[PDB]
């Protein structure tokens, strides 16, 4: 599965989840901890915001 831009949630305005919905992968809390440990502030901001 792969996705560039697709559907978004009604309330949270976030990408959906699952292959059937052409969703996006989840960047959970542990991923954010890993990015913080690396120091990649800009990649983390990209994932959170844009």
């Amino acid at each position: 599965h792969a996705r560039s831009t697709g559907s978004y949630s009604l309330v949270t305005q976030q990408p959906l989840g699952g292959k059937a919905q052409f969703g996006g992968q989840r960047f959970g809390e542990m991923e954010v901890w890993a990015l913080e440990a690396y120091g990649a502030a800009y990649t983390l901001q990209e994932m959170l915001t844009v």
């Binding site: 599965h1 792969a2 996705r3 560039s4 831009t5 697709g6 009604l10 309330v11 949270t12 976030q14 990408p15 959906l16 989840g17 969703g23 996006g24 992968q25 989840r26 960047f27 959970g28 809390e29 542990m30 991923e31 954010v32 901890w33 890993a34 990015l35 913080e36 440990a37 690396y38 120091g39 990649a40 502030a41 800009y42 990649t43 983390l44 901001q45 990209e46 994932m47 959170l48 915001t49 844009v50």
Partner: protein, 1202 residues
């Protein structure tokens, strides 16, 4: 745009100001036109238009009429998204108490008016009256009157007094309070009070009153008169496929509130019995509390589908709450996922990416390049060309992915190596090809595992991926500093096979010009891989100072050893290759290459090592067969002997010579001995063979058995598994824990029978379920560590502190557990390291102890040193570079902005799944305890001294007789109290007995000033102290486990730091996990963050108040600058959970857990959050103040300064 978030109570005027209208009806949408109703929950006049730049009646239906309110309908012609922002309000007929401020213990209302909660609920539930205005009457404010008593005192007095019932009475009591007068009253009484319990009660009440008066909030705002109403698009009512409608439970809760409010308004017009109106007010209160927090008051209301309705608090809080599901983690675009295969041809910086995945992920980039180089006129032309999958699209895709790194992730992400950056190579297929050498970092095996791929978009993200997260940069484990790219499995097996030594192999004794001719001889079938030859080796050594010395010699070696030398980089000794290479040997090769050559040479060497290992493991032809499992002939005879002896001991038991328990114990012992002997016999038979040498006799050689080679090389398997295959399975445990007497006398070669397999299943199920539960336990521990230590970032270079920690080798008996070189590698020296017995300064202060200085210390026999640590740093926020030292993942000094706390938490939490007197040396004897010191001056034996062959200073010769893992760590990090703790000497003084009061005993101690201190000791306590003895502070009175709180209170910071570090490292080292102590010290520093003030002084601190230590330090520095009395404090140890929940930021605390309590306390106190840590900036989408963003935040800290 904003620099802080303020929280506080909501006044009715503020709630009205937020609102764009008043919701008057429970109507939602029409059943035919599906349009919103006027004055409903979805009213377009209150919340905004349903269609972009349209109005309900449809007269103004273009952007020409933007901002014009239609006169026929009232809908403002604007965007629809305003329905996600505009709020409404409900004017309640009767006041209603807020559930959070009432039932979240401790009750803020009850604390404020100083009445028990049950009394307040009795008034609220309309059961008893309360006097609001006492007037010229003996009645007092807040005293209860029942209905009968209210009637009698109404006849007695009449209109002189006022008594009310319900939330209105509480509102009048709250509004009638004079907060400063009450505060002065509590201050005076506290000045003239003695009881400690009443001290605590009035301390909390005074804190609440002072918070209210300072924050500007008014207490009566805890009772709601106007209720805010959420925007409709956040509680949508949407058509599903098939014509069905989907709604949120908030709609039902709001409808109930509005219906009951309207009914109450109607009942107050059609003047009704007081009982009916009272019941309706009860309905209104219950409905409002259900809407705000369902289930707190009592029975949770359910829907037509018979499960509780989800309230706003449920939207806000929990694992499913907005904080953890949508703010701290998100689903992201430009992401994909697929199964992972193995790419043995890849380089360390490369990953195989499928073409279709790259086409989907990089689609905007492809569109951009097609538009730029002119084959696509517009964006639909580019879209059509990509959809049709033309060739030029493939060349464009190659050009976009040419040097754009991608991020690969595998869940669970236990540490930062679980996400790494790679250069993609487009491959045909649907599976991601992963470099083998990174699998150990990912914990990835190719049995169905899936990985996620992310595309960094902006230039900053790309350069972060290339510089920080790229696979070639992360080759050292941040937890320990060891290489994490060490080869495994087939690489190890091939390097082992190629470097083995065979007797009388073809081509023995030959003379070879170098590695090239060894290769030529092997390829020409002149000599074998395992022939003993003499080879000319040219070897270059790079010394510590950088000297390069090259020299050639003839060495007795093997053909395979020279062929492997062909790929070894210059600068390394040949002794590293001239041996059979197991896993440890290859790891040592890589570590030495990194230590003496650098990074690029190391990655090239690793790639060549893996290529060569794969090639020669393929060429070896190693295979497993049923004949490779040789069962020793001694096993059958040993089993027969054990069975006969078991018959003999059964006979002895039948004669009454021995009891049942003795019989069980020694039968277990004999079967254990039989298992050990069978294993030894099988190992001895498996590990050797006899060969014919050149001169013709018989010689002993190490075996080339496939299973033996598999086990000995370290590729896969250990002695236990070969024992299970070709020896005995051994004793197995009953599910309760007991060990069955009869073992399994069969291995897996002849096979087990039914009962043996059943006993095997007994333990297999236990193992699997234990793993399943321990995974979750470790995950929760890691989460807790991350939230406690998240705010620790290297903020300075040098703090200018003189404090330090004393470091010595760890001794737990007659042998060293770990040397001082391991403990000191990477730490900065705090106090000057003088040579023992000399005043010369061997090592200056502020020096990083690298490998060379470690060797210097080892050579000069230094026992005790002093180094800086994180706990002793004086930085106001975070730590400095020197107190932390080397960062293990990079090898140099830690840079400014590294999130050392997250690294520490991940390092500690990752290995959680693997978790579950005669002298022996020559030297002198010293008494402190007992210490035996070698002649060099190093203390090598530490032994207890219970209350001796040699006295103090007497030399002792060798042999002289002088005479549960993870729960433990979790309990230690929360600073739990032991169930039966050790009783410790509170003060230094002379002990004395006391009056043995019935129930439990008392003791007294006389201090140096003559004061008597009394201690409360239980009866069942084996006291160690004796009367007339001056016991020091820190001495043990009753033996038992030691509470860390007592250690901190009576011994100091260093003592508790050492205790925690030693116990957690004992647990970790038991299982063979190596974690540096600086991580644990970071966690411990986060445990020491609060102080209780004992002497109030003149600073704005109350006695017995738990405040932040950094704030007190800053205030004391200011007061010393002003020459005023500073505060006296005691420091507290707090558990990771309690320290996390007591952070200065309420956003982080609310996102951690216990959201209701944190939000209620912050709202009452009027707290302000400055967004200083990582989690707060993650939630608001800002750059984290760590790493690349660090500088940015510093700039803002300058701008706010100016």
């Amino acid at each position: 745009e904003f620099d802080a978030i303020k929280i506080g109570l909501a006044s009715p005027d503020m709630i009205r100001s937020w609102s764009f209208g008043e919701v008057k009806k429970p109507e939602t949408i029409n059943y035919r036109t599906f349009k919103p109703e006027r004055d409903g929950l979805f009213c377009a006049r209150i919340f905004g238009p349903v269609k972009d730049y349209e109005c309900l009646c449809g007269k103004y239906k273009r952007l020409k009429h933007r901002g014009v309110i239609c006169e026929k309908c009232g809908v403002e012609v604007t965007q629809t998204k305003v329905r996600r922002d505009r709020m409404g309000h409900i004017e309640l007929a009767s006041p209603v108490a807020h559930i959070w401020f009432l039932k979240s213990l401790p009750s803020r209302i009850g604390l404020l008016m100083d009445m028990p909660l049950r009394d307040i609920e009795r008034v609220l539930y309309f059961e008893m009256y309360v006097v609001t205005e006492p007037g010229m009457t003996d009645l007092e404010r807040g005293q209860m009157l029942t209905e009968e008593e209210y009637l009698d005192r109404l006849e007695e007095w009449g209109d002189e007094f006022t008594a009310k019932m319900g939330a209105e009475a509480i509102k009048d009591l709250l509004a009638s309070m004079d907060l400063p007068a009450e505060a002065e009253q509590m201050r005076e009484e506290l000045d003239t009070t003695n009881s400690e319990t009443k001290r605590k009660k009035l301390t909390k009440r005074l804190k609440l009153v002072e918070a209210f008066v300072a924050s500007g909030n008014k207490p009566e705002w805890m009772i709601l008169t106007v209720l805010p109403v959420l925007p409709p698009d956040l509680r949508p009512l949407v058509p599903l496929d098939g014509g069905r409608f989907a709604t949120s439970d908030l709609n039902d809760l709001y409808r109930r509130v509005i219906n009951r409010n309207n009914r109450l308004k109607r009942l107050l017009e059609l003047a009704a019995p007081d009982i009916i109106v009272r019941n309706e007010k009860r309905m209104l209160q219950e409905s409002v509390d259900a809407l705000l927090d369902n289930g707190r008051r009592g029975r949770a209301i359910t829907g037509s589908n018979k499960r509780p309705l989800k309230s706003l608090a449920d939207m806000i809080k929990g694992k499913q709450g907005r904080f953890r599901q949508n703010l701290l983690g998100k689903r992201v675009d430009y992401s994909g996922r697929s199964v992972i295969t193995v790419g043995p041809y890849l380089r360390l910086h490369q990953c195989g990416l499928p073409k279709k995945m790259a086409l989907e992920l990089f689609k905007p980039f492809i569109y951009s390049k097609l538009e730029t180089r002119g084959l696509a006129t517009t964006i639909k032309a580019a879209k059509k060309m990509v959809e049709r999958e033309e060739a030029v699209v493939w060349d464009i895709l190659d050009e976009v992915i040419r040097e754009h790194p991608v991020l690969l992730n595998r869940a669970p992400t236990l540490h930062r190596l679980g996400i790494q950056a790679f250069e993609p190579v487009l491959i045909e297929g649907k599976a991601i090809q992963l470099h083998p050498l990174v699998c150990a970092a990912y914990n990835a095996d190719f049995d169905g595992d899936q990985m996620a791929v992310h595309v960094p978009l902006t230039l900053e993200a790309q350069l972060e991926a290339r510089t920080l997260m790229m696979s070639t940069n992360n080759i050292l484990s941040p937890a320990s500093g060891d290489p994490i790219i060490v080869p495994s499995q087939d690489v190890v097996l091939g390097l082992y096979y190629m470097t083995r030594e065979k007797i009388n192999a073809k081509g023995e004794g030959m003379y070879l010009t170098g590695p090239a001719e060894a290769e030529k001889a092997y390829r020409t079938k002149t000599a074998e891989l395992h022939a003993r030859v003499k080879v000319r080796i040219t070897e270059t050594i790079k010394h510590e100072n950088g000297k390069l010395t090259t020299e050639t010699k003839m060495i007795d070696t093997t053909v395979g050893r020279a062929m492997l030398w062909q790929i070894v980089p210059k600068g390394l000794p040949y002794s590293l290759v001239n041996q059979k290479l197991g896993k440890k040997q290859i790891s040592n090769l890589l570590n030495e290459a990194y230590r003496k050559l650098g990074l690029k040479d190391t990655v090239i060497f690793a790639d060549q090592i893996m290529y060569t290992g794969f090639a020669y493991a393929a060429l070896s032809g190693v295979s497993v067969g049923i004949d490779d499992m040789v069962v020793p002939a001694a096993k059958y005879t040993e089993i027969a002997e054990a069975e006969e002896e078991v018959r003999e001991i059964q006979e002895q038991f039948q004669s009454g010579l021995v009891t049942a328990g003795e019989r069980y114990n020694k039968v277990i012992d004999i079967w254990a001995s039989t298992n050990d002997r069978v294993a030894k016999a099988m190992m001895e038979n498996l590990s050797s063979e006899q060969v014919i040498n050149r001169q013709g006799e018989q010689e002993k050689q190490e075996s080339f058995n496939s299973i033996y080679m598999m086990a000995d090389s370290g590729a896969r398997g250990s002695a236990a598994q070969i024992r299970q295959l070709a020896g005995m399975r051994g004793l197995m445990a009953r599910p309760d824990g007991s060990i069955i007497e009869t073992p399994i006398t069969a291995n897996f070669k002849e096979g087990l029978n039914v009962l043996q397999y059943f006993i095997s299943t007994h333990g297999a199920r236990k193992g699997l379920a234990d793993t399943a539960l321990k995974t979750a336990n470790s995950g929760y521990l890691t989460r807790r560590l991350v939230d406690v230590a998240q705010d620790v970032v290297v903020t300075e270079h040098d703090c200018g502190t003189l404090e330090g920690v004393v470091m010595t080798p760890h001794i737990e008996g007659g042998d060293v557990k770990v040397a001082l070189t391991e403990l000191a590698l990477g730490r900065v020296v705090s106090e000057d390291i003088l040579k023992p017995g000399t005043d010369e300064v061997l090592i200056p202060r502020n020096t990083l102890l690298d490998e060379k200085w470690c060797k210097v210390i080892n050579d000069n026999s230094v026992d005790q040193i002093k180094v800086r640590s994180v706990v002793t740093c004086d930085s106001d926020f975070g730590c400095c570079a020197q107190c932390y030292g080397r960062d293990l993942a990079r090898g140099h000094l830690v840079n400014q902005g590294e999130a050392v706390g997250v690294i520490a938490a991940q390092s500690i939490g990752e290995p959680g799944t693997q978790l579950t007197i005669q002298a022996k040396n020559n030297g002198s004897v010293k008494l402190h305890e007992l210490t035996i010191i070698d002649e060099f001056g190093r203390t090598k034996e530490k032994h207890k001294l219970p209350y001796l062959s040699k006295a103090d200073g007497d030399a002792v010769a060798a042999g002289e007789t002088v005479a549960g893992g993870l729960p433990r760590v979790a309990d230690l990090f929360e600073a739990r109290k032991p169930k039966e703790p050790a009783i410790l000497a509170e003060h230094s003084g002379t002990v004395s007995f006391g009056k043995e009061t019935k129930g439990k005993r008392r003791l007294i101690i006389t201090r140096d000033s003559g004061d008597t201190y009394e201690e409360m000791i239980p009866k069942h306590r084996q006291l160690n102290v004796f009367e007339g003895e001056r016991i020091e502070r820190g001495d043990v009175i009753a033996d038992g486990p030691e509470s860390p709180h007592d250690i901190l209170r009576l011994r100091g910071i260093h003592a508790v730091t050492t205790y925690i570090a030693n116990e957690v490292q004992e647990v970790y080292r038991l299982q063979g996990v190596k974690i540096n102590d600086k991580h644990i010290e970071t966690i411990v520093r986060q445990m020491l963050r609060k102080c209780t003030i004992t002497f109030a002084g003149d600073s704005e601190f109350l006695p017995g108040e738990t405040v932040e230590y950094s704030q007190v330090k800053i205030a004391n520095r200011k007061l010393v600058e002003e020459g005023k009395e500073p505060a006296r404090f005691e420091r507290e140890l707090l558990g990771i959970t309690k320290a996390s929940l007591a952070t200065e930021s309420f956003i982080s605390a609310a996102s951690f857990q216990e959201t209701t309590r944190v939000l209620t306390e912050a709202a009452v106190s009027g707290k302000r959050d400055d967004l200083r840590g990582l989690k707060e900036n993650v939630i608001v989408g800002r750059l984290i103040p760590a790493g690349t963003g660090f500088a940015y935040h510093q700039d803002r800290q300058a701008k706010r300064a100016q």
